[PDB]
């Protein structure tokens, strides 16, 4: 019984297998966002961890999506056994932007683990981005965010997990990271610049604008 990407979705559908049994995309999105909003509120009342790393990132995905996906907290490079007896894996993922010629290719196969370990190395070396001058904090926060964009470790829910991870990382470093002033368009623009052009400056400008000490 070979693991395959197809087992993440319902047969003859584009909808991801979920605990709600919802195949309609609109109704699924409503319920998934509802539970993610519940998890967010409980998460912001939870004591901050002593250490920030990829294990904490997986825990946040688990918290945000436990009620939606059987695979909450599990990465797409590792075969995942569903309760239905199928085994899903998705080592190869790409995303197209409607205004860009070429798709963005995410980390392939076990390069997902390398991406997660990359952020762990930065966070150990830079003490969770604590006790740094502002310019260094912004630079490494942008490096971490852009690295997570490439890694895309989960089958779905990457953006939501990455943002709360970064809000909590900032909070432990005595910063308030305000994503409410960031539009879908501005977020996409800075992410494509880092991914395709290898240009981290628009992202660093975004983080500087939304970081309040």
């Amino acid at each position: 019984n070979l693991p395959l990407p197809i087992y993440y979705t319902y047969p003859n559908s584009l909808t991801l297998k979920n605990k709600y049994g919802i195949i309609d995309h609109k109704e699924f999105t409503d319920k998934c966002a509802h539970d993610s909003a519940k998890a967010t509120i409980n998460l912001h009342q939870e004591a901050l961890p002593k250490e920030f790393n990829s294990s904490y990132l997986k825990y946040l995905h688990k918290c945000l999506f436990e009620n939606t996906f059987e695979w909450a907290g599990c990465t797409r490079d590792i075969p995942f056994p569903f309760k239905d007896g199928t085994v899903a894996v998705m080592p190869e993922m790409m995303r197209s932007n409607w205004k860009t010629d070429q798709p963005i290719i995410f980390a392939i196969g076990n390069k997902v683990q390398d991406g997660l370990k990359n952020i762990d190395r930065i966070l150990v070396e830079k003490n969770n981005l604590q006790n740094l001058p502002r310019q260094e904090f912004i630079h490494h926060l942008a490096e971490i965010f852009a690295s997570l964009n490439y890694t895309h470790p989960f089958r779905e829910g990457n953006g939501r997990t990455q943002r709360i991870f970064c809000e909590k990382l900032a909070q432990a470093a005595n910063y308030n990271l305000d994503f409410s002033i960031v539009t879908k368009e501005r977020m996409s623009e800075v992410s494509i610049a880092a991914a395709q052009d290898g240009n981290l400056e628009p992202m660093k400008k975004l983080f500087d604008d939304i970081s309040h000490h």
Partner: protein, 55 residues
């Protein structure tokens, strides 16, 4: 109130993370979040209302 300000910030963060993906929360989700932000009920009662919500 510091506590209510923290609740309001959590609610605004929950809305933002979906808005930045182009997702508008269901009206029922927003109503339950608003009550919590305003201190009408506890975190436990907020959790009950979310789990019992008709979407």
């Amino acid at each position: 109130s510091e506590e209510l300000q923290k609740r309001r910030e959590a609610v605004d963060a929950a809305i933002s993370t979906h808005a930045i993906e182009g997702i508008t929360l269901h009206s029922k989700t927003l109503e339950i979040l608003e009550g919590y932000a305003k201190g009408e009920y506890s975190l436990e009662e907020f959790n009950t209302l979310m789990d019992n919500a008709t979407l």
